[PDB]
Design brief:
Keywords: HCV glycoprotein, broadly neutralizing antibodies, immune system
Structural class of chain B: mainly beta
CATH topology of the largest domain in chain A: Immunoglobulin-like
Entry title: Crystal structure of broadly neutralizing antibody HEPC74
Strand content of chain B: over 45%
Largest interface: A-B, 49 and 50 residues
Number of strands of chain A: 19
CATH superfamily of the largest domain in chain A: Immunoglobulins
PDB class: immune system
Chain A: antibody HEPC74 Light Chain
Number of strands of chain B: 19
Helix content of chain A: under 10%
Largest sheet of chain B: 7 strands, mixed
Largest sheet of chain A: 7 strands, mixed
Number of helices of chain B: 0
Assembly: dimeric
Number of domains of chain A: 2
Distance between the termini of chain A: 59 Å
Strand content of chain A: over 45%
Oligomer: heterodimer
Chain lengths: ~210, ~220
Protein backbone atom coordinates (compact mmCIF):
# COMPACT_ATOMS: atom_id res chain seq x y z
CA UNK A 1 0.00 0.00 0.00
CA UNK A 2 2.50 2.69 1.08
CA UNK A 3 5.03 3.52 -1.66
CA UNK A 4 8.15 5.53 -0.82
CA UNK A 5 9.90 7.40 -3.62
CA UNK A 6 13.07 9.49 -3.57
CA UNK A 7 14.50 12.25 -5.66
CA UNK A 8 16.91 12.86 -7.19
CA UNK A 9 18.06 9.35 -8.08
CA UNK A 10 21.62 10.71 -8.34
CA UNK A 11 23.35 13.84 -7.07
CA UNK A 12 26.88 15.05 -7.76
CA UNK A 13 28.39 17.35 -5.18
CA UNK A 14 31.67 18.72 -3.82
CA UNK A 15 33.14 18.38 -0.36
CA UNK A 16 31.83 21.27 1.66
CA UNK A 17 28.55 21.65 -0.22
CA UNK A 18 25.16 21.82 1.46
CA UNK A 19 23.20 18.84 0.09
CA UNK A 20 19.46 18.15 0.41
CA UNK A 21 17.70 15.04 -0.86
CA UNK A 22 13.99 14.27 -0.82
CA UNK A 23 11.65 11.44 0.04
CA UNK A 24 7.94 11.23 -0.67
CA UNK A 25 5.29 8.91 0.76
CA UNK A 26 2.28 7.92 -1.35
CA UNK A 27 0.04 8.68 1.65
CA UNK A 28 0.52 10.54 4.91
CA UNK A 29 2.89 8.76 7.33
CA UNK A 30 3.12 11.45 10.05
CA UNK A 31 6.75 11.44 11.37
CA UNK A 32 7.23 7.68 10.85
CA UNK A 33 10.26 8.06 8.63
CA UNK A 34 13.91 7.09 8.93
CA UNK A 35 16.99 7.63 6.81
CA UNK A 36 19.80 5.14 6.19
CA UNK A 37 23.27 5.49 4.63
CA UNK A 38 24.84 2.58 2.69
CA UNK A 39 28.26 2.15 1.16
CA UNK A 40 28.56 -0.45 -1.62
CA UNK A 41 28.36 -4.03 -0.40
CA UNK A 42 28.18 -3.04 3.29
CA UNK A 43 25.36 -3.06 5.76
CA UNK A 44 23.47 0.23 5.98
CA UNK A 45 23.58 2.56 8.97
CA UNK A 46 20.66 4.39 10.62
CA UNK A 47 21.06 8.18 10.50
CA UNK A 48 17.68 9.72 11.42
CA UNK A 49 14.40 8.48 12.82
CA UNK A 50 11.10 10.16 13.70
CA UNK A 51 11.86 12.28 10.58
CA UNK A 52 14.19 14.63 12.47
CA UNK A 53 15.84 12.77 15.39
CA UNK A 54 19.55 12.12 14.98
CA UNK A 55 20.55 8.59 15.86
CA UNK A 56 23.17 8.28 18.57
CA UNK A 57 26.74 8.71 17.30
CA UNK A 58 25.75 10.17 13.93
CA UNK A 59 27.60 13.37 12.99
CA UNK A 60 25.49 16.48 13.51
CA UNK A 61 25.99 17.69 9.91
CA UNK A 62 23.08 15.33 9.14
CA UNK A 63 19.55 16.56 9.80
CA UNK A 64 16.09 15.63 8.64
CA UNK A 65 12.84 17.48 8.25
CA UNK A 66 9.28 16.94 7.15
CA UNK A 67 6.01 15.32 8.05
CA UNK A 68 3.11 13.74 6.26
CA UNK A 69 4.13 12.98 2.68
CA UNK A 70 7.27 15.09 2.13
CA UNK A 71 10.62 14.61 3.88
CA UNK A 72 14.17 15.80 3.38
CA UNK A 73 17.64 14.85 4.52
CA UNK A 74 20.24 17.63 4.64
CA UNK A 75 24.02 17.40 4.99
CA UNK A 76 25.16 20.87 6.01
CA UNK A 77 28.75 20.40 4.70
CA UNK A 78 29.31 17.24 2.70
CA UNK A 79 32.40 15.34 3.87
CA UNK A 80 34.53 12.68 2.12
CA UNK A 81 32.89 9.90 4.16
CA UNK A 82 29.44 10.93 2.91
CA UNK A 83 29.61 9.72 -0.71
CA UNK A 84 27.16 6.84 -0.48
CA UNK A 85 23.57 5.90 -1.27
CA UNK A 86 20.88 7.23 1.09
CA UNK A 87 17.57 5.40 1.60
CA UNK A 88 14.50 6.65 3.36
CA UNK A 89 12.27 4.14 5.13
CA UNK A 90 8.72 4.14 6.50
CA UNK A 91 8.25 2.04 9.64
CA UNK A 92 5.13 0.84 11.42
CA UNK A 93 4.16 -2.10 13.60
CA UNK A 94 3.49 -4.34 10.56
CA UNK A 95 6.23 -3.52 8.07
CA UNK A 96 9.23 -1.56 6.98
CA UNK A 97 9.33 -0.13 3.45
CA UNK A 98 12.42 1.44 1.90
CA UNK A 99 12.61 4.09 -0.75
CA UNK A 100 14.70 3.37 -3.84
CA UNK A 101 17.75 5.42 -2.78
CA UNK A 102 19.71 8.49 -3.88
CA UNK A 103 23.37 7.99 -4.82
CA UNK A 104 25.67 10.93 -4.06
CA UNK A 105 28.91 10.99 -6.08
CA UNK A 106 31.88 13.37 -6.17
CA UNK A 107 31.71 16.26 -8.64
CA UNK A 108 34.62 16.95 -10.97
CA UNK A 109 35.03 18.65 -14.32
CA UNK A 110 33.46 17.08 -17.37
CA UNK A 111 35.74 14.52 -19.01
CA UNK A 112 34.92 12.85 -22.30
CA UNK A 113 35.53 9.09 -22.58
CA UNK A 114 38.38 7.69 -24.60
CA UNK A 115 36.78 4.99 -26.74
CA UNK A 116 38.22 1.70 -27.96
CA UNK A 117 36.72 -1.24 -29.86
CA UNK A 118 37.96 -4.83 -29.75
CA UNK A 119 36.95 -7.50 -32.27
CA UNK A 120 36.51 -11.08 -31.10
CA UNK A 121 39.63 -13.16 -30.83
CA UNK A 122 40.22 -15.95 -33.33
CA UNK A 123 40.40 -18.33 -30.36
CA UNK A 124 36.91 -17.46 -29.14
CA UNK A 125 35.57 -17.67 -32.67
CA UNK A 126 36.93 -21.21 -32.95
CA UNK A 127 34.46 -22.19 -30.17
CA UNK A 128 31.40 -20.66 -31.86
CA UNK A 129 30.76 -17.25 -30.22
CA UNK A 130 31.84 -13.68 -30.93
CA UNK A 131 32.18 -11.14 -28.13
CA UNK A 132 32.80 -7.57 -29.39
CA UNK A 133 33.92 -5.15 -26.67
CA UNK A 134 33.61 -1.36 -26.55
CA UNK A 135 35.53 0.43 -23.79
CA UNK A 136 34.75 3.96 -22.54
CA UNK A 137 37.70 5.01 -20.43
CA UNK A 138 37.93 7.68 -17.69
CA UNK A 139 34.86 9.87 -18.17
CA UNK A 140 32.68 12.11 -16.06
CA UNK A 141 29.79 12.43 -15.39
CA UNK A 142 28.42 8.90 -15.28
CA UNK A 143 25.66 9.32 -17.89
CA UNK A 144 26.80 7.74 -21.16
CA UNK A 145 25.08 6.03 -24.08
CA UNK A 146 26.60 3.21 -26.13
CA UNK A 147 24.89 2.12 -29.34
CA UNK A 148 26.10 -0.86 -31.33
CA UNK A 149 25.65 -0.71 -35.10
CA UNK A 150 26.18 -3.70 -37.40
CA UNK A 151 26.21 -2.72 -41.08
CA UNK A 152 24.45 0.43 -39.81
CA UNK A 153 21.61 -1.52 -38.14
CA UNK A 154 21.04 -0.46 -34.53
CA UNK A 155 21.34 -3.42 -32.15
CA UNK A 156 19.10 -4.02 -29.19
CA UNK A 157 18.94 -6.76 -26.59
CA UNK A 158 22.29 -8.42 -27.37
CA UNK A 159 24.69 -6.32 -25.26
CA UNK A 160 25.53 -5.94 -21.58
CA UNK A 161 27.27 -3.03 -19.83
CA UNK A 162 29.42 -2.86 -16.68
CA UNK A 163 30.75 0.26 -14.93
CA UNK A 164 33.52 0.82 -12.42
CA UNK A 165 33.06 2.66 -9.18
CA UNK A 166 34.17 6.26 -9.22
CA UNK A 167 37.98 6.28 -9.24
CA UNK A 168 39.64 7.24 -5.94
CA UNK A 169 42.35 9.28 -7.74
CA UNK A 170 40.72 11.06 -10.68
CA UNK A 171 36.99 10.77 -9.87
CA UNK A 172 36.14 9.26 -13.27
CA UNK A 173 34.15 6.25 -14.38
CA UNK A 174 34.98 3.63 -16.97
CA UNK A 175 32.51 1.40 -18.77
CA UNK A 176 32.55 -1.71 -20.95
CA UNK A 177 29.79 -2.75 -23.34
CA UNK A 178 29.95 -6.28 -24.75
CA UNK A 179 27.98 -7.33 -27.86
CA UNK A 180 27.53 -11.11 -28.03
CA UNK A 181 26.65 -12.92 -31.28
CA UNK A 182 26.92 -16.48 -32.47
CA UNK A 183 29.74 -17.12 -34.92
CA UNK A 184 27.19 -17.69 -37.69
CA UNK A 185 25.45 -14.35 -37.04
CA UNK A 186 28.80 -12.56 -36.70
CA UNK A 187 29.80 -13.80 -40.15
CA UNK A 188 26.61 -12.43 -41.77
CA UNK A 189 27.80 -8.81 -41.58
CA UNK A 190 30.88 -6.70 -42.17
CA UNK A 191 31.01 -3.39 -40.28
CA UNK A 192 30.92 -3.47 -36.45
CA UNK A 193 30.69 -0.09 -34.70
CA UNK A 194 30.29 1.31 -31.20
CA UNK A 195 28.86 4.85 -31.07
CA UNK A 196 29.30 6.72 -27.79
CA UNK A 197 27.27 9.74 -26.69
CA UNK A 198 28.51 11.71 -23.69
CA UNK A 199 28.15 15.38 -22.86
CA UNK A 200 31.92 15.84 -22.94
CA UNK A 201 31.66 15.13 -26.69
CA UNK A 202 30.03 17.70 -28.97
CA UNK A 203 29.31 14.89 -31.43
CA UNK A 204 29.14 11.17 -30.69
CA UNK A 205 32.36 9.23 -31.24
CA UNK A 206 32.28 5.99 -33.21
CA UNK A 207 34.94 3.29 -33.29
CA UNK A 208 34.50 0.55 -35.86
CA UNK A 209 36.18 -2.31 -37.65
CA UNK A 210 35.53 -4.47 -40.70
CA UNK A 211 35.23 -8.17 -39.81
CA UNK A 212 38.28 -10.11 -40.94
CA UNK A 213 40.56 -7.14 -41.72
CA UNK B 1 27.38 -6.16 20.02
CA UNK B 2 27.48 -8.41 17.00
CA UNK B 3 25.07 -10.30 14.80
CA UNK B 4 26.72 -13.42 13.42
CA UNK B 5 25.23 -14.82 10.20
CA UNK B 6 25.45 -18.21 8.55
CA UNK B 7 27.45 -18.65 5.40
CA UNK B 8 26.96 -18.13 1.70
CA UNK B 9 24.76 -20.67 -0.10
CA UNK B 10 24.30 -21.73 -3.73
CA UNK B 11 20.80 -23.13 -4.20
CA UNK B 12 18.93 -24.58 -7.13
CA UNK B 13 15.81 -22.81 -8.39
CA UNK B 14 12.73 -24.20 -6.68
CA UNK B 15 14.66 -25.13 -3.52
CA UNK B 16 14.60 -23.47 -0.08
CA UNK B 17 17.32 -21.84 2.00
CA UNK B 18 17.51 -21.24 5.76
CA UNK B 19 19.81 -18.41 6.91
CA UNK B 20 20.56 -17.74 10.57
CA UNK B 21 21.43 -14.73 12.71
CA UNK B 22 22.86 -15.20 16.22
CA UNK B 23 23.16 -12.33 18.66
CA UNK B 24 26.24 -11.63 20.77
CA UNK B 25 24.85 -10.39 24.08
CA UNK B 26 17.06 -11.83 23.26
CA UNK B 27 16.27 -9.40 20.49
CA UNK B 28 13.80 -9.28 17.67
CA UNK B 29 15.64 -9.78 14.39
CA UNK B 30 14.67 -8.59 10.90
CA UNK B 31 15.96 -9.50 7.47
CA UNK B 32 16.67 -7.03 4.65
CA UNK B 33 18.07 -8.13 1.31
CA UNK B 34 19.85 -6.45 -1.59
CA UNK B 35 19.90 -8.02 -5.05
CA UNK B 36 22.75 -7.02 -7.39
CA UNK B 37 22.34 -3.44 -8.51
CA UNK B 38 19.07 -3.00 -6.59
CA UNK B 39 17.92 -1.22 -3.47
CA UNK B 40 17.34 -2.50 0.03
CA UNK B 41 14.22 -4.64 0.39
CA UNK B 42 12.74 -5.67 3.73
CA UNK B 43 11.84 -9.38 3.84
CA UNK B 44 10.43 -9.98 7.30
CA UNK B 45 11.31 -10.37 10.94
CA UNK B 46 10.19 -11.08 14.48
CA UNK B 47 8.06 -8.27 15.93
CA UNK B 48 9.41 -6.75 19.17
CA UNK B 49 5.77 -6.09 20.20
CA UNK B 50 4.12 -9.47 19.61
CA UNK B 51 7.22 -11.71 19.47
CA UNK B 52 5.67 -13.24 16.35
CA UNK B 53 6.73 -12.93 12.72
CA UNK B 54 5.82 -10.13 10.33
CA UNK B 55 6.47 -10.43 6.62
CA UNK B 56 6.53 -8.14 3.63
CA UNK B 57 3.50 -8.81 1.45
CA UNK B 58 5.64 -9.89 -1.49
CA UNK B 59 7.05 -12.81 0.52
CA UNK B 60 3.98 -13.81 2.56
CA UNK B 61 3.28 -17.46 1.83
CA UNK B 62 6.92 -18.17 0.89
CA UNK B 63 9.05 -17.15 3.92
CA UNK B 64 9.04 -18.45 7.50
CA UNK B 65 10.91 -16.71 10.31
CA UNK B 66 11.57 -18.57 13.57
CA UNK B 67 13.65 -18.01 16.67
CA UNK B 68 15.31 -20.41 19.13
CA UNK B 69 15.68 -18.38 22.31
CA UNK B 70 17.92 -21.11 23.78
CA UNK B 71 20.61 -20.36 21.17
CA UNK B 72 19.92 -16.61 20.65
CA UNK B 73 19.36 -17.47 16.98
CA UNK B 74 16.73 -16.32 14.50
CA UNK B 75 16.19 -18.05 11.14
CA UNK B 76 14.75 -16.97 7.80
CA UNK B 77 13.64 -19.83 5.55
CA UNK B 78 12.81 -18.75 1.98
CA UNK B 79 11.23 -21.36 -0.26
CA UNK B 80 10.49 -21.77 -3.97
CA UNK B 81 13.69 -19.88 -4.73
CA UNK B 82 13.88 -17.94 -8.00
CA UNK B 83 16.74 -16.23 -9.81
CA UNK B 84 15.61 -12.83 -8.52
CA UNK B 85 16.08 -14.09 -4.94
CA UNK B 86 19.84 -14.00 -5.51
CA UNK B 87 20.90 -11.32 -3.06
CA UNK B 88 22.81 -10.47 0.09
CA UNK B 89 20.52 -11.08 3.08
CA UNK B 90 21.34 -8.91 6.12
CA UNK B 91 19.97 -9.26 9.61
CA UNK B 92 19.43 -6.40 12.05
CA UNK B 93 17.86 -5.90 15.48
CA UNK B 94 14.36 -4.39 15.39
CA UNK B 95 14.44 -2.36 18.57
CA UNK B 96 11.65 -0.39 20.25
CA UNK B 97 13.13 3.10 20.46
CA UNK B 98 10.48 5.69 21.35
CA UNK B 99 6.79 6.19 22.01
CA UNK B 100 4.39 8.94 21.11
CA UNK B 101 0.91 9.24 22.54
CA UNK B 102 1.02 5.70 23.86
CA UNK B 103 2.18 4.17 20.57
CA UNK B 104 5.74 2.82 20.48
CA UNK B 105 7.92 2.45 17.41
CA UNK B 106 10.77 0.13 16.49
CA UNK B 107 13.69 0.68 14.17
CA UNK B 108 16.33 -1.46 12.51
CA UNK B 109 19.36 -0.36 14.52
CA UNK B 110 23.09 -0.92 14.27
CA UNK B 111 24.96 -3.11 13.94
CA UNK B 112 23.66 -5.26 11.18
CA UNK B 113 25.06 -8.62 10.38
CA UNK B 114 27.71 -8.84 7.66
CA UNK B 115 25.22 -10.32 5.19
CA UNK B 116 24.78 -13.77 3.67
CA UNK B 117 24.89 -14.23 -0.08
CA UNK B 118 22.30 -16.61 -1.47
CA UNK B 119 22.89 -17.42 -5.14
CA UNK B 120 19.98 -19.13 -6.91
CA UNK B 121 21.37 -21.03 -9.89
CA UNK B 122 21.54 -24.40 -11.62
CA UNK B 123 25.11 -23.74 -12.78
CA UNK B 124 28.01 -25.90 -11.61
CA UNK B 125 31.36 -24.52 -10.51
CA UNK B 126 33.33 -23.78 -13.66
CA UNK B 127 36.50 -21.90 -14.45
CA UNK B 128 36.68 -19.24 -17.16
CA UNK B 129 37.96 -19.09 -20.69
CA UNK B 130 40.32 -16.16 -21.18
CA UNK B 131 40.53 -14.34 -24.49
CA UNK B 132 42.70 -11.39 -25.54
CA UNK B 133 41.41 -7.90 -26.17
CA UNK B 134 44.24 -7.11 -28.54
CA UNK B 135 45.50 -3.51 -28.90
CA UNK B 136 45.08 -1.72 -32.20
CA UNK B 137 49.59 8.29 -27.80
CA UNK B 138 47.77 5.82 -25.52
CA UNK B 139 46.60 2.31 -26.40
CA UNK B 140 44.16 0.04 -24.61
CA UNK B 141 44.35 -3.76 -24.33
CA UNK B 142 42.77 -6.34 -22.10
CA UNK B 143 41.49 -9.82 -21.33
CA UNK B 144 37.94 -11.12 -21.61
CA UNK B 145 37.28 -13.57 -18.78
CA UNK B 146 34.20 -15.50 -19.86
CA UNK B 147 31.86 -18.22 -18.67
CA UNK B 148 32.76 -18.90 -15.02
CA UNK B 149 30.73 -19.71 -11.91
CA UNK B 150 30.47 -18.64 -9.12
CA UNK B 151 32.01 -15.28 -8.47
CA UNK B 152 34.70 -14.11 -8.07
CA UNK B 153 37.67 -14.07 -10.39
CA UNK B 154 40.73 -11.94 -9.82
CA UNK B 155 42.87 -10.49 -12.59
CA UNK B 156 46.37 -9.06 -12.35
CA UNK B 157 48.71 -7.81 -15.07
CA UNK B 158 52.35 -8.83 -15.52
CA UNK B 159 52.15 -10.75 -12.24
CA UNK B 160 51.31 -7.55 -10.33
CA UNK B 161 54.06 -5.41 -11.88
CA UNK B 162 51.44 -3.41 -13.85
CA UNK B 163 48.71 -1.68 -11.83
CA UNK B 164 48.39 1.88 -13.12
CA UNK B 165 45.70 2.40 -15.74
CA UNK B 166 44.03 -0.95 -15.01
CA UNK B 167 40.26 -1.24 -14.87
CA UNK B 168 38.78 -4.63 -14.00
CA UNK B 169 35.08 -4.35 -14.47
CA UNK B 170 32.40 -5.87 -12.28
CA UNK B 171 31.10 -9.14 -13.62
CA UNK B 172 27.84 -9.46 -15.49
CA UNK B 173 25.56 -12.46 -15.21
CA UNK B 174 24.88 -13.76 -18.70
CA UNK B 175 21.66 -15.42 -19.83
CA UNK B 176 23.56 -18.75 -19.76
CA UNK B 177 23.88 -18.40 -15.96
CA UNK B 178 27.65 -17.93 -16.17
CA UNK B 179 29.55 -14.75 -15.29
CA UNK B 180 31.82 -12.73 -17.54
CA UNK B 181 34.12 -9.77 -17.01
CA UNK B 182 36.78 -7.83 -18.86
CA UNK B 183 39.95 -6.31 -17.47
CA UNK B 184 41.63 -3.55 -19.45
CA UNK B 185 44.80 -1.47 -19.22
CA UNK B 186 46.01 1.60 -21.09
CA UNK B 187 49.70 1.72 -22.05
CA UNK B 188 51.95 3.85 -24.28
CA UNK B 189 51.51 2.96 -27.95
CA UNK B 190 55.30 2.97 -28.37
CA UNK B 191 55.69 0.14 -25.85
CA UNK B 192 53.63 -2.30 -27.93
CA UNK B 193 55.67 -4.99 -29.64
CA UNK B 194 58.69 -4.45 -27.35
CA UNK B 195 57.02 -4.98 -23.97
CA UNK B 196 55.04 -8.08 -23.03
CA UNK B 197 51.57 -7.84 -21.49
CA UNK B 198 50.10 -10.87 -19.71
CA UNK B 199 46.88 -11.08 -17.73
CA UNK B 200 46.88 -13.49 -14.81
CA UNK B 201 43.40 -14.81 -14.07
CA UNK B 202 42.57 -16.76 -10.91
CA UNK B 203 39.22 -18.45 -10.20
CA UNK B 204 39.54 -19.95 -6.74
CA UNK B 205 36.24 -21.93 -6.66
CA UNK B 206 37.41 -24.15 -9.54
CA UNK B 207 41.11 -23.76 -8.67
CA UNK B 208 41.83 -22.49 -12.16
CA UNK B 209 44.72 -20.19 -12.99
CA UNK B 210 45.25 -18.96 -16.56
CA UNK B 211 47.90 -16.62 -17.95
CA UNK B 212 47.25 -15.06 -21.35
CA UNK B 213 49.72 -12.92 -23.28
CA UNK B 214 47.95 -10.08 -25.11
CA UNK B 215 49.68 -8.89 -28.27
CA UNK B 216 48.83 -7.00 -31.44
CA UNK B 217 47.29 -9.22 -34.09
CA UNK B 218 49.30 -9.94 -37.25
Amino acid sequence: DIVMTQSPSTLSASVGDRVTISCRASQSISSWLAWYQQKPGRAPKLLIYKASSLETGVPSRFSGSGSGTEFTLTISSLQPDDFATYYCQHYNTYLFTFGPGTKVDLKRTVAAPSVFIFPPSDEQLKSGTASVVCLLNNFYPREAKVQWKVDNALQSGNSQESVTEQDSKDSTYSLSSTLTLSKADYEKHKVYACEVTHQGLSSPVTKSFNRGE
Amino acid sequence: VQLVQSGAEVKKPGSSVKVSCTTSGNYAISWVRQAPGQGLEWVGGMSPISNTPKYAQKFQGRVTITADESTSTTYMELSSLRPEDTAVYYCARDLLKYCGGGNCHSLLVDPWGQGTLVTVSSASTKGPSVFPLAPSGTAALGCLVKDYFPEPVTVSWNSGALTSGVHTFPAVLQSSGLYSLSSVVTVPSSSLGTQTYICNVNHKPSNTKVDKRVEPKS
